[PDB]
């Protein structure tokens, strides 16, 4: 059955609380999350505090991560830790030894990679004795650093990205398997949607233990089709099913690791229903690892330079009370506690090259022919899945997935995306 | 008319990374060691990233840690000077997340950033204002390095905007400083004296704030072009003292040698004690010297990476806490010059300036330039030269106020050693 969790934004001080955590408030924060019926949280230490020198990891920062995990467990939550932030809510947190006079690419500078390796090992080893420590993600949407849009871009080609993922995941993959924990990585949706982007779809769907997707309908979907359109309400289920096309394993779990109802496209009055119906569509996709809502506690209004909608994403308001979206999410957990999605047997076909990479990612981005073909089949009640053209010509893969019907469409780029 | 003697305080063991979790018993021992030298003050350096992690939130714990370090300085018998904005330390930039990449801005021209720096200056002064040991503030360590074209993530500004930035931040506390008995200053690296085209102008250091600050580092081409133990190198700090007075409106304005060391990349380790003694000998023969503040107290531990190597040796106390040979020289220099009063300097070299009092050619007063060598040659000859501008040379009142009786002129010949 699906797991239900929340991305943990500390009340009152946000991630600025890591300098001097208020453990009694954090204990209360985590207790509130558990009261929703959530079974896990995802937490975010800051790279700048963890590793202020390339060869010195701050022991107090590690002990603070340990204490937050410990409090998560005492609240009855499994705790997932993102190692490298890196990036959170429009802000970059990059240690001084990788900035300006020391500027470097985290993806290709060998000394930086060895530092990220040491940090990954230090986080795992710090937490490894804890019953509540459930697994690690390399870091939140690290691919945003290498995208051509980034104003201080860290360069990398696709081969170097694959090596970066393999290096860091390979440090802990064996331990995670024998310990019963998970190792994953996380990209924003440029990996699915942006042609020329150095993170490739198959990286998300084949590397690490589960696929992560982050579903944000401010990516042009809500603006182009309407915030409460089938395209918008189904966007998270679309990412789940799209991602499986690029998976070698036919029942690999897909983790909707971040999803929210962004107020820059969805009116606040629609956000509870956006939450309920988005989770309804996700729950009708097989093999969903879980849904992790963004986020637990609203950002205090005294903090500046956030995009305004980021402040409202919290399930709990600044005074600690449960919002209407929080109620919807609580109710969605109860609704889908034991939901089992039936197999999906009609697949749309993604044309790919001989390496299994899309001929045109823009066609599966919002506004694209493949995006809309899936959305139309979904609106017609046909419950589509997604396959590549390579797999379409392999009956063993089709049989293992139960696919009996194939729908094909031409490649047409969308222009609604970002 | 007596010089103060102090040390720039680099915390033992953890360097400025100690601000994450200060080891107060070690810091107390650090400051007692500095006082044991006979030093009467320290200069301390909080980190901007920890003080102000959001544009509109200053972290109260970071403020309380600054207050506690000042308190321990006082308990050691030291006056404490605080640099507000780092900003820049020993090749590293510490710039908060809200002023980088997606949030990239210039601290010199972005009005909302200027208002944040104002709030931080006021918060630091106000936190420390009731403390007997708090002796004054500098806006920040060598902030001009952020606007130089050499900087790889330059914060733009023209010379007018730099003047406004200084006037704005200094103007916040200038009157309180005067009524309370404290000082306000600003600090630039030597590009202000040497770099043609630089938006910080010499008259800014010599007229704005209460005392002129200079940072004397003979790796700026002086040690290379003339030799590490040359007169040009041993006299370089006194040269900056006398050069700076040419651009001061106040004829007896104090000049603070706020940072000076014997950098191992140009000065042999065996020569550093004599470099310390004789540099201070030269400074002590310049009138109106506010004080000498050695860089730095405690050597950087070898476990920390990516520092220019010479930065590790600069400490008066070794990584094991024992007093180095330079520390002995500096201790002995304090005792030698406790009561040294420098006689007036009456022979002046003339700096040609435009109608605004700015050099016609800064390269001529940089290492290798005609004006640079004219002062050094007169000093080596025992002539104890001072420096005035061409505007001052044609003003009998200014000449009278400074006791200038003899003027030496040289044609402008640019240097290229800088």
UniProtKB/TrEMBL annotation, chain A:
Top-level taxon in the UniProt lineage: Bacteria
Entry binding sites for N-acetyl-D-glucosamine: 87, 90, 141
InterPro entries listed in its UniProt record: GH
Name assigned to this protein: Glycosyl hydrolase
Organism of derivation: Bifidobacterium longum (strain DJO10A)
UniProtKB/TrEMBL annotation, chain B:
InterPro entries reported for this sequence: GH
UniProt-annotated binding residues for N-acetyl-D-glucosamine: 88, 91, 142
Coiled-coil residue windows: none
Name used for this protein in its record: Glycosyl hydrolase
Lineage: Bacteria, Bacillati, Actinomycetota, Actinomycetes, Bifidobacteriales
């Amino acid at each position: 059955h699906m797991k239900f969790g929340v991305n943990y934004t500390p009340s009152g001080e946000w991630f600025y609380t890591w300098l001097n955590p208020k453990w009694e408030v954090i204990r209360r924060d985590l207790a509130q999350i558990a009261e929703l019926g959530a079974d896990h949280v995802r937490i975010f230490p800051l790279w700048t505090l963890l590793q202020p020198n390339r060869t010195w990891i701050n022991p107090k920062a590690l002990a603070d991560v340990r204490r937050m995990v410990e409090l998560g467990g005492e609240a009855g939550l499994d705790v997932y830790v993102d190692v490298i932030q890196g990036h959170l809510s429009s802000f970059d947190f990059v240690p001084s030894w990788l900035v300006s006079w020391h500027e470097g690419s985290m993806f290709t500078d060998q000394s930086a990679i060895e530092a990220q390796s040491a940090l990954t090992e230090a986080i795992y080893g710090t937490l490894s004795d804890m019953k509540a420590f459930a697994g690690l993600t390399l870091g939140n949407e690290c691919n945003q650093f290498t995208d051509a849009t980034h104003p201080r871009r860290m360069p990398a080609n696709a081969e170097q990205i694959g090596e970066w993922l393999d290096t860091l995941i390979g440090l802990v993959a064996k331990r995670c398997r024998r310990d019963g924990r998970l190792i994953a990585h996380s990209e924003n949706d440029a990996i699915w949607y942006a042609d020329g982007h150095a993170f490739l779809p198959r990286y998300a769907s084949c590397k690490g233990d589960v696929t992560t997707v982050h579903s944000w309908v401010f990516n042009g979907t809500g603006q182009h089709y309407g915030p409460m359109s089938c395209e918008s309400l189904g966007h998270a289920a679309w990412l789940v099913e799209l991602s499986k096309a690029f998976a070698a394993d036919p029942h690999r779990p897909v983790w909707v690791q971040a999803i929210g109802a962004p107020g820059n496209v969805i009116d606040s009055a629609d956000a509870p229903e956006f939450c309920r119906r988005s989770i309804d569509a996700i729950a009708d996709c097989p093999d969903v690892f879980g849904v992790t809502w963004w986020c637990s506690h609203r950002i205090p209004s005294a903090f500046s330079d956030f995009p305004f909608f980021e402040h409202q994403l919290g399930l709990f308001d600044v005074d600690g009370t449960l919002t209407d979206v929080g109620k919807a999410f609580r109710d969605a957990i109860a609704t889908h506690r034991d939901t089992v999605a039936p197999p999906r047997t009609t697949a749309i076909v993604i044309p790919v090259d001989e390496q299994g990479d899309p001929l045109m990612r823009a066609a599966q981005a919002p506004g694209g022919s493949l995006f809309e073909a899936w959305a139309n089949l979904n609106r017609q009640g046909e419950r589509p899945c997604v396959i590549t053209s390579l797999d379409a010509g392999n009956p063993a893969k089709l049989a293992n997935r139960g696919i009996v019907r194939l729908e094909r469409v031409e490649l047409v780029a969308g222009h609604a995306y970002n």
